[PDB]
Amino acid sequence: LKQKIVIKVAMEGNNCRSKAMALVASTGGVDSVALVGDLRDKIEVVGYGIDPIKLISALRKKVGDAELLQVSQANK
Amino acid sequence: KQKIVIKVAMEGNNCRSKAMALVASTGGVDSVALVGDLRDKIEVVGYGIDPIKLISALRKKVGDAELLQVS
Amino acid sequence: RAIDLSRERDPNFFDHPGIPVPECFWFMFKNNVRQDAGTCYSSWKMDMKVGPNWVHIKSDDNCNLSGDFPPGWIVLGKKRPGF
Numbered sequence: 087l088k089q090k091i092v093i094k095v096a097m098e099g100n101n102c103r104s105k106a107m108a109l110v111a112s113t114g115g116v117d118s119v120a121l122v123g124d125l126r127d128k129i130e131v132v133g134y135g136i137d138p139i140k141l142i143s144a145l146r147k148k149v150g151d152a153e154l155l156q157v158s159q160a161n162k
Numbered sequence: 163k164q165k166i167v168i169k170v171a172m173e174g175n176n177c178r179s180k181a182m183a184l185v186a187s188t189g190g191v192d193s194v195a196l197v198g199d200l201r202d203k204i205e206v207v208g209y210g211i212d213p214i215k216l217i218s219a220l221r222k223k224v225g226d227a228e229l230l231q232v233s
Numbered sequence: 234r235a236i237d238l239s240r241e242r243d244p245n246f247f248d249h250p251g252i253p254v255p256e257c258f259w260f261m262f263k264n265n266v267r268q269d270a271g272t273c274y275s276s277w278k279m280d281m282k283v284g285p286n287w288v289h290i291k292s293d294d295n296c297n298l299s300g301d302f303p304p305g306w307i308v309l310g311k312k313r314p315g316f
């Protein structure tokens with residue numbers, strides 16, 4: 087049922103990560119969102135019915151460059 | 163580093179989307195998570211978060227909100 | 234290379250409350266430089282971008298990770314404390 091998606095966000099300046107967190111969190115079906123990773127530049131989101139390709143497109147349009155890094159199932 | 167838990171009245175179209183966006187946009191936030199079987203409590207973790215400011219915004223924009231924990 | 238994961242610092246992770254706690258830590262290296270790390274389930278699978286390519290990575294009961302990684306890259310696993 088639930089998906090885990092991880093996105094790397096470019097640190098281009100002016101609170102990119104905060105803005106990306108906000109945009110990801112606003113997506114329908116989200117249960118949780120966290121800033122993670124060795125460089126604190128990855129957003130990990132868990133939820134249902136999230137389209138990862140659309141989420142990347144929206145980040146690139148509204149916040150800055152972003153890359154999809156992981157898609158996995160969370161229903162162990 | 164703080165964990166803040168807020169119960170929000172989220173009983174209509176897009177409530178959780180709006181609430182999550184507002185909380186996740188706050189300065190110093192590391193994570194935001196819906197908890198409880200009804201996913202009606204928001205757990206936010208981070209640094210330098212003003213719970214009064216956050217609650218005020220939720221009450222104005224989403225619905226009734228109650229502070230449950232600040233640790 | 235055998236990389237000594239016993240001396241790697243833990244990932245910066247978040248145990249999302251609505252899904253089970255994952256049992257493993259993973260570490261991704263490019264030419265022996267740690268690029269990142271995180272968590273994953275044991276006895277499971279994930280799709281991850283490893284350098285230029287998506288890789289289907291499988292984990293065993295002991296957090297050993299298998300995949301067909303691009304040249305110079307590897308993703309290695311270990312059990313989290315207590316698991």
Ligand SMILES: [Cl-]
Nearest residue numbers: 227228229230
């Ligand atoms: Cl209250």
